[PDB]
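Q: Joint fold for the lines below.
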Amino acid sequence: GVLYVGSKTKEGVVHGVTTVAEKVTNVGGAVVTGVTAVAQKTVEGAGSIAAATGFV
Amino acid sequence: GVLYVGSKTKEGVVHGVTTVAEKVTNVGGAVVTGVTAVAQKTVEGAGSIAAATGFV
Amino acid sequence: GVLYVGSKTKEGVVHGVTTVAEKVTNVGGAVVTGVTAVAQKTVEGAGSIAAATGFV
Amino acid sequence: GVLYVGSKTKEGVVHGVTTVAEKVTNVGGAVVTGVTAVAQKTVEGAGSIAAATGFV
Amino acid sequence: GVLYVGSKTKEGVVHGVTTVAEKVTNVGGAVVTGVTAVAQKTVEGAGSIAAATGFV
Amino acid sequence: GVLYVGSKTKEGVVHGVTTVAEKVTNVGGAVVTGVTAVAQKTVEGAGSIAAATGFV
Amino acid sequence: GVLYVGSKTKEGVVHGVTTVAEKVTNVGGAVVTGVTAVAQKTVEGAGSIAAATGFV
Amino acid sequence: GVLYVGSKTKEGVVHGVTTVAEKVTNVGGAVVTGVTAVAQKTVEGAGSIAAATGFV
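A: Joint structure:
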């Protein structure tokens, strides 16, 4: 079909994924970040996005 | 189909994936970042985006 | 189909993937960063983008 | 299909992947960075982009 | 005497004086702006900081 | 006396004086801006900082 | 006396005085801008800093 | 007296005075700009810094 996106900002400070440790880090397979962030049909068909982590 | 995206900003400081350790880092397979970030059909058919990490 | 993107900014400082350690770094297979970042069909067919890392 | 991207900026400094260590670095296979960053069909067919690293 | 200032932040977007008109602008004589903004003894003695505006 | 100032940041986008008109601009005589902004004894004795503007 | 300033940053984009018109600009006599901006005794004695503007 | 300033940065772009017009510009007498900007005793004695402008 159709997807229409229209945006207008002036100030914006965007942080997609932020991680802090003070005393392992796996980040995902389809990460979309921004002032105008658009994602469409990340997986189609018999696809796969697997983000695993193992620990012993 | 159709995807139309239009954006207008003046100030914006974008950070897609940010990691901090003060006292292992694996980042993913399709990371799209910016003031205007668009992603389409990141996987199609029998594809794969696997972001694994093992630890002992 | 059709993918249209139009952006207009004035000030913006973008950081796609940023890692900091103060006391191992594997970065991913399709990383797109910028004031205007667009990605289409990062995988098609029986493709693969694997960002793995093991630790002992 | 058709892919159209148009952008207009004045001030912006982009940093695609940035790593800092203060007390091993593997960077990925398809990294696209700029004020206007566009990537299309990074993998097609039975292709592969692997950013793997081991440590002992 | 003594003035001690100590600060630690991670993210902060500071705007000292911001003005918007959509359909005259006089700004002051001692304007201090920042993440750590310190001002001491702006006027001493028989001084003066006059910020006037006249309109017909 | 003594003025001691100490600061530590990581991300901060500072804007001292910002003016916008969409449909006259006079800016002041002692404007100090930045991530660490310090001002001392901006006027001493019989001084003057005058930011005037007239309009017909 | 003593004035001590110590700063440590990583990312910061500073804009001291910024003016925008979309449909006369007088900027001031002592403007200090930067990641670390320090000003001391901008006027001493019988000094003067006058940022005036008239309009008909 | 004593003035001491110490700074350490990595990424930062400074713009002291910035003017934009899309449909007269007078800039001031003591403008100090940089990643580390320091100004001391801009006027001393019976001095003067005047940034004046008239319009008809």
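Q: Anything notable?
A: The interface with chain B takes residues 11, 13 of chain G (CB under 8 Å). The CA atoms of residues 30 and 43 of chain G lie 10 Å apart.
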